[PDB]
Motif scaffolding. Structure first.
Motif, PDB file in Angstrom:
ATOM      1  N   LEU A 174      -7.725   0.659 -10.401  1.00 47.65           N
ATOM      2  CA  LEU A 174      -7.066  -0.660 -10.510  1.00 47.65           C
ATOM      3  C   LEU A 174      -5.951  -0.586 -11.563  1.00 47.65           C
ATOM      4  N   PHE A 175      -6.242  -0.065 -12.748  1.00 48.21           N
ATOM      5  CA  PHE A 175      -5.306  -0.087 -13.896  1.00 48.21           C
ATOM      6  C   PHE A 175      -3.987   0.535 -13.453  1.00 48.21           C
ATOM      7  N   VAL A 176      -4.083   1.680 -12.774  1.00 51.24           N
ATOM      8  CA  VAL A 176      -2.897   2.476 -12.357  1.00 51.24           C
ATOM      9  C   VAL A 176      -2.263   1.797 -11.145  1.00 51.24           C
ATOM     10  N   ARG A 177      -3.091   1.313 -10.221  1.00 48.92           N
ATOM     11  CA  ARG A 177      -2.636   0.650  -8.978  1.00 48.92           C
ATOM     12  C   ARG A 177      -1.831  -0.609  -9.324  1.00 48.92           C
ATOM     13  N   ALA A 178      -2.290  -1.390 -10.323  1.00 42.24           N
ATOM     14  CA  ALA A 178      -1.650  -2.649 -10.804  1.00 42.24           C
ATOM     15  C   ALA A 178      -0.241  -2.346 -11.339  1.00 42.24           C
ATOM     16  N   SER A 179      -0.126  -1.357 -12.216  1.00 38.79           N
ATOM     17  CA  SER A 179       1.174  -0.852 -12.730  1.00 38.79           C
ATOM     18  C   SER A 179       2.080  -0.451 -11.554  1.00 38.79           C
ATOM     19  N   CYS A 180       1.600   0.369 -10.625  1.00 40.96           N
ATOM     20  CA  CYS A 180       2.457   0.870  -9.524  1.00 40.96           C
ATOM     21  C   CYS A 180       2.891  -0.294  -8.636  1.00 40.96           C
ATOM     22  N   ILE A 181       1.990  -1.217  -8.313  1.00 40.13           N
ATOM     23  CA  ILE A 181       2.380  -2.401  -7.499  1.00 40.13           C
ATOM     24  C   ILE A 181       3.416  -3.230  -8.265  1.00 40.13           C
ATOM     25  N   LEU A 182       3.205  -3.440  -9.561  1.00 39.38           N
ATOM     26  CA  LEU A 182       4.126  -4.231 -10.421  1.00 39.38           C
ATOM     27  C   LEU A 182       5.515  -3.608 -10.392  1.00 39.38           C
ATOM     28  N   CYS A 183       5.619  -2.289 -10.567  1.00 39.77           N
ATOM     29  CA  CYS A 183       6.929  -1.582 -10.548  1.00 39.77           C
ATOM     30  C   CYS A 183       7.662  -1.854  -9.225  1.00 39.77           C
ATOM     31  N   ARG A 184       6.995  -1.642  -8.102  1.00 41.28           N
ATOM     32  CA  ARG A 184       7.603  -1.863  -6.772  1.00 41.28           C
ATOM     33  C   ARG A 184       7.973  -3.353  -6.612  1.00 41.28           C
ATOM     34  N   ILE A 185       7.071  -4.275  -6.915  1.00 40.84           N
ATOM     35  CA  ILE A 185       7.351  -5.729  -6.716  1.00 40.84           C
ATOM     36  C   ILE A 185       8.545  -6.111  -7.591  1.00 40.84           C
ATOM     37  N   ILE A 186       8.538  -5.729  -8.867  1.00 37.52           N
ATOM     38  CA  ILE A 186       9.621  -6.160  -9.782  1.00 37.52           C
ATOM     39  C   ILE A 186      10.939  -5.687  -9.194  1.00 37.52           C
TER      40      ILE A 186
ATOM     41  N   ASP B 103       0.869  -1.212   0.000  1.00 40.61           N
ATOM     42  CA  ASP B 103       0.000   0.000   0.000  1.00 40.61           C
ATOM     43  C   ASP B 103       0.895   1.249   0.000  1.00 40.61           C
ATOM     44  N   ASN B 104       2.014   1.210   0.730  1.00 40.04           N
ATOM     45  CA  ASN B 104       2.892   2.390   0.932  1.00 40.04           C
ATOM     46  C   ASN B 104       4.035   2.346  -0.094  1.00 40.04           C
ATOM     47  N   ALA B 105       4.543   1.156  -0.404  1.00 38.78           N
ATOM     48  CA  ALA B 105       5.759   0.959  -1.214  1.00 38.78           C
ATOM     49  C   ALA B 105       5.437   1.174  -2.705  1.00 38.78           C
ATOM     50  N   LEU B 106       4.157   1.079  -3.111  1.00 39.49           N
ATOM     51  CA  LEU B 106       3.703   1.361  -4.506  1.00 39.49           C
ATOM     52  C   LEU B 106       3.650   2.881  -4.733  1.00 39.49           C
TER      53      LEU B 106
END
Ligand SMILES: CC(C)=CCC/C(C)=C/CC/C(C)=C/COP(=O)(O)C(Cl)(Cl)P(=O)(O)O
Ligand SMILES: CC(C)=CCC/C(C)=C/CC/C(C)=C/COP(=O)(O)C(Cl)(Cl)P(=O)(O)O
Ligand SMILES: [Mg+2]
Ligand SMILES: [Mg+2]
Ligand SMILES: [Mg+2]
Ligand SMILES: [Mg+2]
Lengths: 519, 510
Positions: free
Chosen positions: B407-419, B371-374
């Motif tokens: 969701l569309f933007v949240r998914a991208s931001c979570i993906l960037c942080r996770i990767i 939630d914070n790291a994205l």
């Protein structure tokens, strides 16, 4: 753009985007001109040569050699080479004073009789022209220099246009328009490269270097105008329905204030500030309502752009560009000079807009100020305290709040420059407004337009005398600020001679078109 | 001496056949329009895409794909694994749904028929197609695990030079996860090796690449002059911020026509990397609170209370945010400064929560940290900025909506942080399982969020091009760069190499 600027901005960027042959030749010719300045000559011939180096725009390349030449000539023990020679006396007087070596006005006494300057001097035009030029180095209370000016002006005018010797004819006409002392270095250099080439005493090596160095400096200017144009189109202010030619006119003025390549970054920042002064002056004078301008002023005073969106686009864009550019300039001082200049740039903008408000208040109220009331405000409203304090921020060694406070306190040296810039601009107006110098003095003293203009012309001569004397005691100021303060006055004289065709001709020959070399 | 990609002296110097390009563009336009077998067409436009040329032919490529989706006789792909797989992927790539059941011919109830292990072209196309899948599309999951195993098993045993290169390349990253522009440079070399190489398409790929590269070089000159102008190149906490940011930005968007937006994204990227280091390595507690407070109030009155090395990043963030918001007013008719000021305030709040956890010894859940790291990774900042600069008729309403991270933007931001966390506290957070088992779980979240991204592109959305592309392409940038961040050894030389081939060295012609 519509309406059209002097030059299209896409063309101006074109310009910056001088074969290696020429930079190598330039170093070679430079060393040859050093040798010439250093070489033994008769004292008059040496003064004439370094006066030529100066007028060609080259003193900045030979500061050491020229001063050391001048000191030598001041040490030359026998005075017979100048005594009773009006030309030699005049030029010596001028070059010595220009270089901070005092020469008394008494040296001119022998050229007078009981009634004034000897009428017979009118038989030697070169002498009259050198007397004319020298008179402008005078101080207050140097009554003989005032007589010299009046006499040499009168005698030269009795022949202006009718001198049957081309090069002296051109120089006399040029001088009566503006004395060399009142002209910019950079625009004088271009004119004088042409004049010099036509003169009898031409040194082809000096002339060849002057053209080469001119073209090399010009190439730095062309790159600056490219960057500045890109910035200006970037702001969108080229599309405001006012301040046509704002950017190019500011930059052409800047070249009068400082032309040297090594002051490129400072020159670019001054040109950005001039372009915003011209633009925002027009926002206040030929666009905004009193209520819009109150908000513009308040946002600037508080350095807080929260309420910016209450202004329409054509007022909001100038305001936010002033804000963004002032922050960038302040930041440069922090990055480059170790001192955050944002408080300083915010403060001179707040001072300037407050002066606009007072002007607009008078204009709406119908109030008709005296000349001294008008000038204490109008020396601020012309924008030169802004431009000069900013120039000081960007160049002073070890900038501090106390130093910047001192410059913004209008020491006599700076007050003289700013008042001069305002009065010179006011004298440049043709057919008429209770809020300009001439009309304020007319209103004060019941004077005619003619008598009032003569009064304001006298104030110009008086403030120049104080400027001149300040340089013999520069006090806390040093180069390059000393030159900036004088050169903004020269810019004013040059750009407000008592039109677009003239401006384009000047911009074409100084910024756009290289001098043809025969190399 | 070798030109140093990290030397701002060198980078500042950058900037200082179009007829043949316009001629060959029309020849290539004619090849995409001309009649071919439906499979040969798909292969041709996949080639155009992979050469990074789709942006030159969006209308000819779409109409090609629509024409193939209407071709009535299915005999050309039924029982052909390559053709079934290529059709699936190209169709879904263009928002034309194909069900996962088109891969029925190749499986029974027990799964994919072990027979297909010889069919390298087929296995590779299957593998690439599998990443166009959505959640609960379990046949596509099985195609991936299967294709991956069979492809690993044959890798060094493929006679075709170009097919061998493509298999090795795909197993490192599927085409779907790769950037357009970095892939284009790679694929120009591989394509030249292919049996079915079209020399007109290859010559145009090289010419367009060099033309686009010359645009990027002018951008890097301007950006390098800006960065040296900020003085932030001379700061400690250094990491070649601008050049790295620019190399990322090129993954997010490469098109010459998006030049100004790219430059502004590259600036924001350089400032995010710089200020993150200010908050994570250099700044004291009292210093970070002033920075955060100055940002929150957009009031630089107290800037002078910060030391030089902190005041400079702060005033540069302020000045650049004011410039970008101003560009929105000038160019898009909408003052963006309140927007840029907000995304910076939100970003610094993500930094404050990191420290409120570390100092209170708090250990968050994976869901809590992400939630914070994205936000802290800075892709909300970058993407909301990219939307401000590109959306038609921007308004506060539309900007509040994107900044809410639907969701569309949240998914991208979570993906960037996770990767990013996969390539060095996501793994540590899920563990609080062991290292190996968390990683496997986080790799799973990557596949999951990618399926949600993929589905979003089919679903009703306020969003249009180019922001739809920005949002997917930052994720590709992250995939491509994330394990070469270390800034020494293998990581540094692979980055320098990418830098040199895509930004500096033109492709030799003839
Ligand atoms: C040295 C330098 C960089 C100069 C920049 C150009 C500037 C700001 C020049 C100030 C003088 C100018 C251009 C006067 C013309 O403006 P005007 O509206 O006539 C006026 Cl004199 Cl300011 P006012 O508004 O008082 O009537
Ligand atoms: C698409 C675009 C313009 C990107 C700009 C460059 C950006 C902001 C890259 C973010 C990914 C990077 C460089 C992460 C490395 O930084 P880190 O301090 O390890 C961190 Cl992952 Cl941000 P964290 O502080 O959470 O440990
Ligand atoms: Mg005005
Ligand atoms: Mg005015
Ligand atoms: Mg960090
Ligand atoms: Mg961090």
């Amino acid at each position: 753009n519509y309406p059209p600027n002097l030059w299209d901005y896409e063309f101006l960027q074109s310009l910056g985007d001088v074969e290696e042959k020429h930079l190598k030749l330039a170093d070679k010719l430079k060393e040859e001109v050093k040798s010439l300045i250093k070489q033994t000559m008769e004292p008059l011939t040496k003064l004439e040569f370094i006066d030529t180096v100066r007028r060609l725009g080259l003193k900045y390349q030979f500061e050491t050699e020229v001063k050391e030449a001048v000191v030598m000539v001041s040490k030359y023990e026998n005075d017979a080479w100048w005594i009773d020679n009006l030309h030699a006396t005049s030029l010596r007087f001028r070059i010595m004073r220009e270089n901070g070596i005092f020469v008394p006005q008494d040296v001119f006494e022998r050229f007078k009789d009981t009634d004034g300057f000897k009428n017979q001097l009118c038989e030697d035009v070169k002498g009259l022209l050198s007397l004319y030029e020298a008179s402008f180095l005078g101080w207050e209370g140097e009554d003989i220099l005032d007589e010299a000016r009046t006499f040499a002006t009168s005698k030269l005018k009795s022949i202006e246009g009718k001198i049957p010797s081309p090069s002296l004819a051109k120089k006399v006409s040029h001088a009566l328009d503006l004395p060399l002392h009142w002209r910019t270095i950079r625009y004088e250099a271009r004119w004088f490269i042409d004049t010099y080439e036509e003169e009898e005493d031409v040194n082809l090596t000096l002339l060849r270097y002057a053209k080469l160095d001119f073209n090399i400096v010009q190439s730095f200017h062309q790159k600056e105008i490219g960057r500045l144009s890109r910035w200006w189109v970037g702001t969108g202010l080229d599309k405001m329905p006012f301040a046509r030619n704002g950017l190019i006119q500011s930059y052409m003025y800047a070249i009068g204030m400082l032309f040297e390549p090594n002051l490129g970054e400072v020159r670019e920042m001054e040109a950005k500030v001039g372009a915003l002064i011209t633009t925002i002056d027009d926002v206040y004078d030929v666009y905004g309502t009193m209520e819009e301008l109150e908000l513009f002023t308040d946002i600037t005073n508080r350095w807080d752009i929260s309420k910016a969106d209450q202004l329409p686009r054509n007022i909001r864009m100038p305001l936010l560009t002033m804000f963004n550019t002032s922050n960038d300039i302040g930041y440069w001082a922090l990055k480059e000079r170790g001192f955050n200049g944002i408080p300083c740039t915010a403060k001179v903008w707040s001072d300037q807009l407050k002066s606009y408000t007072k002007e607009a208040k008078w204009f709406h109220e119908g109030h008709k100020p005296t000349l001294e009331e008008y000038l204490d405000n109008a020396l601020v409203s012309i924008g030169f305290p802004n431009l000069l304090v900013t120039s000081y921020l960007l160049t002073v060694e070890n900038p501090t709040k106390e130093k910047l406070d001192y410059v913004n306190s209008l020491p006599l040296f700076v007050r003289a420059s700013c008042i001069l810039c305002r009065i010179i601009n006011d004298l440049g107006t043709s057919p008429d407004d209770n809020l300009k110098s001439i009309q304020c003095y007319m209103n004060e003293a019941g004077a005619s337009q003619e008598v009032a203009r003569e009064h304001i012309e006298g104030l110009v001569r008086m403030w120049w005398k104080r400027l001149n004397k300040c340089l013999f005691e520069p006090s806390p100021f040093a180069e390059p600020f000393l030159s900036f303060t004088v050169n903004v006055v020269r810019g004013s004289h040059f750009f407000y001679q008592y039109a677009e065709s003239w401006t384009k001709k000047q911009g074409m020959s100084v910024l756009i078109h290289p001098i043809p070399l025969n190399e």
